[PDB]
Amino acid sequence: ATFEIVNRCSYTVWAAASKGDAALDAGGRQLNSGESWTINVEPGTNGGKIWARTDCYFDDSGSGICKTGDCGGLLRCKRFGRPPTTLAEFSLNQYGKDYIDISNIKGFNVPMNFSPTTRGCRGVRCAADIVGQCPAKLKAPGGGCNDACTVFQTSEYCCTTGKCGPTEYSRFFKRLCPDAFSYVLDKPTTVTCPGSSNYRVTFCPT
Secondary structure, three states, X not given: OEEEEEEOOOOOEEEXXXXXXXXXXXXXXXXXXXXXXXXXXOOOOOOEXXXXXXXXXXXXXXXXEEEEOXXXXXXOOOOOOOOOOOEEEEEEEXXXXXXXXXXXXXXXXXXXXXXXOOOOOOOEEEOOOHHHHOOHHHEOOOOOEOOHXXXXXXXXXXXXXXXXXXXXXXXXXXXXXXXXXXXXXXXXXXXXXXXXXXXXXXXXXX
16 A cells, blocks of 8 residues: 655654564655655555654654654664653554554644545545644643643553543544544444555644
């Protein structure tokens, strides 16, 4: 499957793509404002994610740091990124269908649209100004809007037991972005697409 990753933000981002235990394609790349990077993701990939990273520095060997979404200091991510990270999430070729969503469970850094480029389903978007409107207690001094699990490490925010409900913090993310997951047990906003669809992830779509 192809994923065209497009940076419509006015600032550079470093895109990242991983399934948690391995890179997808090269795993990461710099995207200046307006640049597009097309990756290939193996069919059957389960639990893949794409995200933006901001305010990064890398040496010539591809080692460094980002202020949001850093994946072990690598340019080419092999693992998931450090919150806050708006997440484009997907599982491909799962019994004949693909499944896509956007999640704020690991916080929010950059607005994104995640849409198919092929027929048969709709896209999802979280493009509101979550960082600007972020509750004081969730603001990440390094940049972005943290989720409450990250900040407070409770059973209720992290849904550790599997019994949790919505919270005043999850409801903030849900208000700003109804079509993204706001906590682990949120009413799903997953879209079913045809198996082997292709996609575009756009940072700062609006």
